[PDB]
Amino acid sequence: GLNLVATALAVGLGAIGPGVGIGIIVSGAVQAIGRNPEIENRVVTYMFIGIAFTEALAIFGLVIAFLIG
């Protein structure tokens, strides 16, 4: 049963940081967009960089859970 609990924790825990960091990223990006519409391409590119960085950890946790599964 531990294996199932470990899978739940690996999926559950380790996604909170990659549940709030993405939200903070998007909130900052939309705030900058409202503050500056003509910089949309640059801010969206850096937003996608941040999203990729966060999804890297998210996928790491998910694949670790799959290995535990």
Partner 1 sequence: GFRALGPGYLKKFFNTNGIMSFVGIIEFISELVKPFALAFRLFGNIFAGEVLLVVMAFLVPLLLPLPFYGFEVFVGFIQALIFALLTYAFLNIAVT
Partner 2 sequence: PITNSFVVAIIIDIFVIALAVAATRNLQMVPRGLQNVMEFILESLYNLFRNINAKYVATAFPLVATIFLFVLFGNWFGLLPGVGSIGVCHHDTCAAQGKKLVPLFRAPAADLNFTFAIAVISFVFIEYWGFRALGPGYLKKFFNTNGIMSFVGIIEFISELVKPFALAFRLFGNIFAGEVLLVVMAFLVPLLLPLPFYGFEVFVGFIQALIFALLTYAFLNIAV
Partner 3 sequence: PIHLEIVTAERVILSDDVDMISAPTKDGRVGILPRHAPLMTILEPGELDIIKNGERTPFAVSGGFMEVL
Judged by CB under 8 A, the stretch of 2-10, 12-20, 32-40, 60-68 that binds partner 1 is 60-68
- C-beta of 52: minimal distance to partner 1 in Å? 5
DSSP category for residue 14: T
41 binds partner 3 (CB under 8 A): no
Contact by Cβ (8 Å): 47, 29: yes
- Decide: residue 10, CB within 10 A, 0-12 exposed, 13-18 middle, 19+ buried: buried
User: What does the binding site for partner 2 look like in residue numbers (CB under 8 A)?
Assistant: 41-42, 45-46, 48-49, 51-53, 55-56, 59-60, 62-63, 66-67
